[PDB]
Structure 1
Amino acid sequence: TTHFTVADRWGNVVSYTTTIEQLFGTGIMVPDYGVILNNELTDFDAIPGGANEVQPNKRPLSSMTPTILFKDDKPVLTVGSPGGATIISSVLQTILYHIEYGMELKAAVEEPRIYTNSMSSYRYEDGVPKDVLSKLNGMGHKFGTSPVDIGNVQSISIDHENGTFKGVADSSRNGAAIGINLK
């Protein structure tokens, strides 16, 4: 998965998450045509009967969360990320740090993240304090012994008062933000 975002001088705003599922998808390339094929259908439940069971012509449940935030009826922030089920958590945390904690956008994006979907599945990024992890594990959590990167948030902020845009790429990949100043 990858997430990108664009905003233009006419007020159009795009927030676009897009994927082939696993890195390199199935690994299968259409011979003579160079196209790598998704494994997206493994996003269905393997055991049928539930909401996300496989059915013909059905779409497998996604976690992609391209998002646009508005203030006073104008778009002011775009957020999104890759990372499977962790996406929802990366988008959540970016919004929390920028809005609830009032952090500058790059700082909000770089704030160490955590993710946990169950009692047996935990991830944390470098910078989550060791003493905190110890404390939480003491209470019943199951954080592991090593950090991992979680997500890759690209984000644009729009200042309608001053007529400016700010773009941010997450350090977890080699992304680039490029502003436009015409003429």
Structure 2
Amino acid sequence: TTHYSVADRWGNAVSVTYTINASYGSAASIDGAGFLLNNEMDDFSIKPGNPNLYGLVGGDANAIEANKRPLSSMSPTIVLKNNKVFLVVGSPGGSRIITTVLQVISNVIDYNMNISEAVSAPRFHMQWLPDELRIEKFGMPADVKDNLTKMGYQIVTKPVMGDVNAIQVLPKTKGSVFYGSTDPRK
């Protein structure tokens, strides 16, 4: 999965997340055509309660049916301020997309980080099952981990989450200024 963000001088913004699901999709290509096929069918629930590639589970709502579109977690997002473009943001990461994107938005709005700071900041993740608080290397100091563990979290350090490409737009006396960040994770 990969996300890209575009904003122009006329006030259009386009936030695109697209994918073949796994890295290199199904790993099978169309002979003669040179492209990899997706493995997007794994985003369905293939059996009630069966965890997919991202540990996500389902029942009736996300069961397979002919022509049905498998449930995604992709979250291409635009944030507006007074109806003008403010953020263009998104990320890959399967189940982690939702939490990655909201953390970047929160970092800007709640903590007044610029877009580079908001993207670089360590990320955590909770997805109900598994019942764990997923964190990143160097992302949480002992004091914070200790306090969260006391609350009843099971903290686990896992590979870095996401790959945010984000734009922040700020008005100027004349026009706007566009600020960008790619993700130090990849």
Scaled by the length of structure 1, the TM-score of the pair is 0.87
In structure 2, the CA distance between the partners of 1:166 and 1:101, relative to structure 1 (3 Å rule), is: same
Q: In 2, are the aligned partners of 1:123 and 1:148 still within 8 Å (CA)?
A: no
Q: Could you tell which deviates more after superposition, 117-126 or 83-92?
A: 117-126
Per the TM alignment, residue 71 of structure 1 is displaced from its structure 2 partner at its CA by 1.1
User: Where in structure 2 are the equivalents of 1:150-165 lying within 5 Å?
Assistant: 150-162=161-173, 163-165=176-178
Counterpart in 1 of 2:88? 78
Q: In 2, are the aligned partners of 1:114 and 1:123 still within 8 Å (CA)?
A: yes
Counterpart in 1 of 2:23? 23
Secondary structure of the 1:52 match is: coil
**Alpha-carbon distance between aligned partners in 2 of 1:26 and 1:116, rounded to the nearest angstrom:** 27
Counterpart in 1 of 2:98? 88
Match of 1:99 among 100, 109, 113: 109
Secondary structure of the 2:125 match is: strand
Give the residue type in structure 2 aligned to 1:92: L
Identical amino acids, percent of aligned pairs: 44
RMSD: 1.5
Residue deviations 1:20-51, cap 9 Å, x none?
00101111111222110100011011225521
- 2:61 aligned with 1:51: yes
Unmatched 5+ stretches in structure 1: 174-183
Moved over 6 A (4+): none
In structure 2, the CA distance between the partners of 1:39 and 1:122, relative to structure 1 (3 Å rule), is: farther
Counterpart in 2 of 1:168? 181
**Alpha-carbon distance between aligned partners in 1 of 2:92 and 2:45, rounded to the nearest angstrom:** 20
Counterpart in 1 of 2:131? 120
**Alpha-carbon distance between aligned partners in 2 of 1:16 and 1:128, rounded to the nearest angstrom:** 31
Secondary structure of the 1:116 match is: coil
Aligned length: 172
Unmatched 5+ stretches in structure 2: 49-58
User: Where in structure 2 are the equivalents of 1:52-67 lying within 5 Å?
Assistant: 52-67=62-77
**Alpha-carbon distance between aligned partners in 1 of 2:182 and 2:164, rounded to the nearest angstrom:** 6
**Alpha-carbon distance between aligned partners in 1 of 2:62 and 2:158, rounded to the nearest angstrom:** 30
Per the TM alignment, residue 81 of structure 1 is displaced from its structure 2 partner at its CA by 0.5
Residue deviations 1:122-171, cap 9 Å, x none?
42112212332233233322222x34201111111112224211111111
**Alpha-carbon distance between aligned partners in 2 of 1:25 and 1:134, rounded to the nearest angstrom:** 39
**Alpha-carbon distance between aligned partners in 2 of 1:70 and 1:82, rounded to the nearest angstrom:** 22
Counterpart in 1 of 2:152? 140
